Design a protein around this ligand. Structure first.
Ligand code: HEM
Length: 411
């Protein structure tokens, strides 16, 4: 199939997470050609594609996504555009800081933070879950990475991280908010990187600030103070991004009352399942980009070298070939499902040790289960009349009212 139009890019902006889905349905196929971002593309959807997309003997990420995304979300020349053993080397670094012990540590700081906020929320009129999340995560993330953060600095930093996430799929004021935030974080963090290297800021072995400051590339030399910031930022920023998911976690519990007592009567497993369903059902990761390395043939289609390709993450997550009533929130669909690396890919697919799959899936899940465990057991509240609606054309997406809470009371 081939969309011959000459503005798919503007269209993509109007449809968002449904852009690829809208055409893999129309053209009745798992992939289609289009003209996106100045280049010739091939958008594909589905787990079988994911399997091919993550085949690095066929796909490279270098030169894949536009600079505007680097200049607002990832940073210029960060791990995201890396390929080969160079990428697997920088990648083992992120993993070392995202292991079960850490996850455990992070969910733990959040738990007390959550419990501590209650005394404050019980006195407020309202509370905007998205705003409470932004701060706490930011304050915790730093603490955990060993990055210093003054109380009167949390908001600004918490906000700068988010302006970066909220810019990747936008044009105009929204894009710029992040084209300006980025330069402020890098600056801020590149200083600590330099201070660490001077033994002027205390750093503790095994924490992101330490490991980034002292990492060693294959050639044996260390990262430019600037790149180490960007890389430490690609740890801090993502954790603050868990704000979205957390707002969705609450939102589901509201729109799906029945699942409340379900969780409350259950254990960690009921949570684990309610979380995994939030990561699958709700929009966040739009898709991914890559360049075809060698000319190959798959699904009767010819992929020419240098052709650009988008992997629909949202669509693979809602494809009936892999899920019953994919557009239904059903925590149970996860009871007994064997673990897989391509059926569900909300934070990427395949191996994290062999590819670009998010290495923060553990932390994201662990942090989310905690957040939920709190909303369900520690407090009781009211969801006052508001705008919970969330668009699928806007990327990223979020319940308009940031999810307002009221009459919060200890449980
Ligand atoms: C809050 C929700 C999160 C979402 C939806 C998310 C989503 C994703 C996606 C879709 C990718 C790309 C996969 C690919 O390119 O093939 C990725 C990469 C990555 N994520 Fe996340 N992420 C999240 C949380 C986290 C957390 C909290 C951390 C840090 C602890 C983190 C660290 C990273 C890193 C550094 C990479 C780049 C890996 C590479 O390029 O090889 N993330 N993530």
């Amino acid at each position: 199939p081939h969309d011959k139009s000459l503005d798919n890019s503007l269209t993509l902006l109007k449809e968002g997470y449904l852009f690829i889905k809208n055409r893999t349905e129309r053209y009745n196929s798992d992939l289609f050609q289009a003209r996106l971002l100045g280049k010739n593309f091939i958008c594909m959807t589905g787990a079988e594609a994911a399997k091919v997309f993550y085949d690095t003997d066929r796909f490279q990420r270098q030169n894949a996504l536009p600079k505007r995304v680097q200049k607002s979300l990832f940073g210029v020349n960060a791990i995201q555009g890396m390929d080969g053993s160079a990428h697997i080397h920088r990648k083992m670094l992120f993993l070392s800081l995202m292991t079960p012990p850490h996850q455990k540590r992070l969910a733990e700081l959040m738990t007390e933070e959550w419990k501590a906020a209650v005394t404050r929320w019980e006195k407020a009129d309202e509370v905007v879950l998205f705003e409470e999340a932004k701060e706490i995560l930011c304050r915790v993330a730093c603490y955990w990475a060993g990055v210093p953060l003054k109380e009167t600095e949390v908001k600004e930093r918490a906000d700068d991280f988010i302006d970066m996430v909220d810019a990747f799929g936008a044009v105009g004021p929204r894009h710029w908010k992040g084209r300006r935030a980025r330069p402020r974080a890098e600056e801020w963090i590149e200083v600590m990187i330099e201070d660490a290297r001077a033994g002027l800021l205390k750093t503790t072995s095994g924490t992101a600030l330490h490991e980034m400051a002292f990492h060693t590339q294959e050639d044996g030399s260390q990262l430019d103070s600037r790149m180490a910031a960007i890389e430490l930022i690609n740890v801090l920023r993502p954790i603050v991004a868990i704000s979205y998911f957390l707002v969705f976690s609450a939102l589901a519990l509201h729109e799906h009352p029945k699942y409340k007592e379900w969780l409350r009567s259950g254990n960690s497993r009921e949570r684990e399942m309610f979380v995994q369903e939030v990561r699958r059902y709700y929009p966040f990761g739009p898709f991914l980009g890559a360049l075809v390395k060698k000319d190959f043939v798959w699904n009767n289609c010819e992929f020419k070298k240098g052709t650009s390709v988008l992997l629909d993450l949202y669509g693979t997550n809602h494809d009936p070939r892999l899920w019953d009533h994919p557009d239904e929130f059903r925590p149970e669909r996860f009871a007994e499902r064997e673990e897989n690396l391509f059926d569900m890919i909300p934070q990427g697919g395949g191996h994290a040790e062999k590819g670009h799959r998010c290495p923060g899936e553990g932390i994201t899940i662990e942090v989310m289960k905690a957040s939920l465990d709190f909303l369900v057991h520690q407090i009781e509240y009211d969801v006052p009349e508001q705008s919970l609606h969330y668009s699928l054309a806007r990327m990223p997406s979020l319940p308009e009212s940031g999810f307002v809470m009221s009459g919060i009371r200890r449980k």
